[PDB]
Design a protein around this ligand. Structure first.
Ligand SMILES: NC(=O)C1=CN([C@@H]2O[C@H](COP(=O)(O)OP(=O)(O)OC[C@H]3O[C@@H](n4cnc5c(N)ncnc54)[C@H](OP(=O)(O)O)[C@@H]3O)[C@@H](O)[C@H]2O)C=CC1
Ligand SMILES: NC(=O)C1=CN([C@@H]2O[C@H](COP(=O)(O)OP(=O)(O)OC[C@H]3O[C@@H](n4cnc5c(N)ncnc54)[C@H](OP(=O)(O)O)[C@@H]3O)[C@@H](O)[C@H]2O)C=CC1
Lengths: 333, 333
């Protein structure tokens, strides 16, 4: 079996990724946590044989083949570099890095190391998004003209779960949600964004206010214009992703969550019908693709390059919102 | 009865406004058309006693009390000024004018003339939009956070209806659709937009291409961020208007057309339910309000000032799309 080591004893690894690794035929052999106590307790609760408290004891363990990183965002880049230096494959939760030169550097070093580097954008693995991508390529909507993304949800400010715990350094809806919208759009449209405009909302007067909502528009290389709406403050808005074309529209409802749910309708001259979907665990699909890539068959679902694309788009959106100006998206890949 | 004269022997006056005037207790006594033949034929077909071919014979007719203007956009400002000089009330199809100083001048001259000046933004008359406005003011969604407008429809390029007829000087989705979205948002939110960002699409390479789609964002004075999507090129997208708040969301579907149709759902902690609506002809409602205003009771549905607001927002959106920069919306009222 491919044996994984975890960097970050996280909620997402517990809820989704550990089970996904095992479902896809791998095994999770070790977990690294900055805290000895947290790592041991987490190892016992999730059936993992070993807990460590150094990154090097994780990535350097001869019996770890691959590393999954789900620590706080600012730790990703350096922990991925350590794994790559140890010659281990890396699946990294977004973001890869906090800036583009660091993200580009990762992709190059992984390539130079001969290891698989993946960004865990989960949504592009859903059968909903895959159906839309495939229907578009099959001409079922003629030429795509416009896209819409709805990702305005409710995330209580500060959690965790014991109360309103650790400092938790932000840092906003754009870098936490919009980047997933960007990657999913790139997947569905099979095309790249070239510029962004945006307006964002921060709580309380311009400050250390959490950026808690954003709306904007991406211009894609094809000419498609794609709007997005991401927030932490709206309880009663369902998520969605739509693509409107010259001969049809695809309407995805409830398709931007972590769970394998949601519908896609195709509307065209015949009327409306639901596309048939075989829903499957997004994370199971991501791990399977990663395992095939390690095997020298195929690529991760989202590559290091996709992660650089999502980071560049996010950074563009932050700048367009802050400056009021349209910003060109350039990856430096 | 209040007796109306028509300036423009138009599709909209035939389909909607003539019948609305009569339903609301007025009468249409004359029609002005630049063509004698068209005006006579139109008068006979629509049961109007008189056709003329000069604006002054229309506005100066002692038996016309009020004037409805639905000519080509560039004629509005000057024809409204003639009516106002003749001391007649004016209901003007959007736009009032092509620039802000001309729109502001109209409002002032109408006020100085002692006549009612209305802009015929039809949508704010619908029971759907009215229900949303009222539910918001009643606290049914807590504090509004975000709005979304969907107005991407199919309008064949060039019509008319005999084939692909007269030159028809454009001039785009922003000034033809976005301005109605703006006015409706102002009505529903009871608040003003203060800045815009946008990206627009023109057919064929940057040129004399028709601007045939736009997406953008308005920042409102309250802090609400409101996105819109308007187009001429999408056949299979339903229209809609939504408002998402801290304690609920209002979802309007099929509510941006001329017809008295559409639904509004309120989603909140109880679930989702349809708001009960008494649908009524939008134009009948607009005329009734105008007739009351002439009577010295109440105001037109949308005033001259609302028309200046819609024009300023439209002009901001054109500039933000052209320049890539956020533009502040200032009415000069
Ligand atoms: N709500 C969210 O957190 C969201 C997260 N993401 C993405 O998912 C990834 C992980 O997120 P998620 O699984 O939700 O995060 P968790 O809060 O479950 O874990 C993240 C990190 O916080 C630390 N931590 C966990 N529990 C405690 C505790 N009781 N006291 C102190 N520190 C603790 C852990 O440190 P250690 O590993 O050292 O034990 C862990 O690496 C991130 O990389 C992020 O990009 C995306 C959107 C929302
Ligand atoms: N599709 C549209 O036209 C849209 C219109 N609007 C708004 O509605 C208003 C009127 O629109 P609508 O009723 O659709 O326009 P119509 O095309 O029906 O009429 C507009 C003008 O075009 C002229 N016209 C009409 N028929 C002919 C013909 N056979 N040959 C030459 N000229 C002709 C008329 O001139 P005359 O009056 O001199 O007879 C008339 O004033 C406008 O002010 C605009 O702002 C808004 C969105 C879309």
């Amino acid at each position: 079996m491919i044996r994984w080591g975890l960097i970050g004893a996280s909620t997402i690894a517990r809820e989704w990724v550990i089970g996904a690794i095992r479902a896809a035929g791998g095994e999770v052999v070790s977990v690294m946590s900055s805290s000895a106590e947290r790592g041991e307790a987490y190892a016992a609760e999730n059936g993992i044989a070993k807990a460590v408290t150094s990154v090097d004891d994780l990535v350097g363990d001869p019996d770890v083949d691959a590393v999954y990183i789900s620590t706080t965002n600012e730790l990703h880049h350096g922990q991925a570099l350590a794994a790559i230096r140890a010659g281990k494959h890396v699946l990294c939760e977004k973001p890869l890095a906090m800036n583009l030169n660091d993200g580009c550097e990762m992709v190059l070093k992984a390539c130079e190391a001969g290891v698989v580097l993946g960004t865990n954008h989960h949504l592009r693995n859903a059968a909903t998004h895959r159906a839309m991508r495939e229907a578009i390529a099959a001409g079922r909507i003629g030429r795509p003209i416009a896209a819409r993304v709805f990702h305005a949800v409710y995330l209580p400010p500060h959690l965790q779960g014991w109360r309103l715990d650790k400092p938790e350094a932000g840092g906003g809806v754009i870098l936490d949600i919009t980047v997933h919208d960007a990657d999913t759009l790139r997947f569905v449209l099979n095309d790249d964004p070239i510029e962004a405009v945006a307006i964002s909302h921060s709580a309380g007067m311009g400050k250390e206010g959490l950026e808690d909502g954003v709306m904007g528009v991406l211009r894609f290389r094809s000419g498609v214009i794609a709007q997005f709406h991401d927030a932490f403050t709206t309880k009663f808005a369902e998520t969605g992703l739509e693509v409107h074309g010259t001969a049809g529209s695809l309407i995805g409802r409830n398709v931007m969550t972590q769970r394998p749910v949601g519908t896609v309708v195709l509307r065209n001259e015949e009327g409306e019908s639901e596309l048939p979907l075989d829903h499957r665990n997004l994370y199971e699909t991501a791990i399977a693709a990663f395992h095939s890539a390690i095997g020298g068959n195929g690529r991760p679902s989202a590559s290091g390059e996709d992660g650089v694309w999502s980071l560049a788009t996010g950074l563009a959106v932050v700048k367009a919102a802050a400056t009021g100006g349209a910003v060109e998206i350039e990856t430096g890949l």
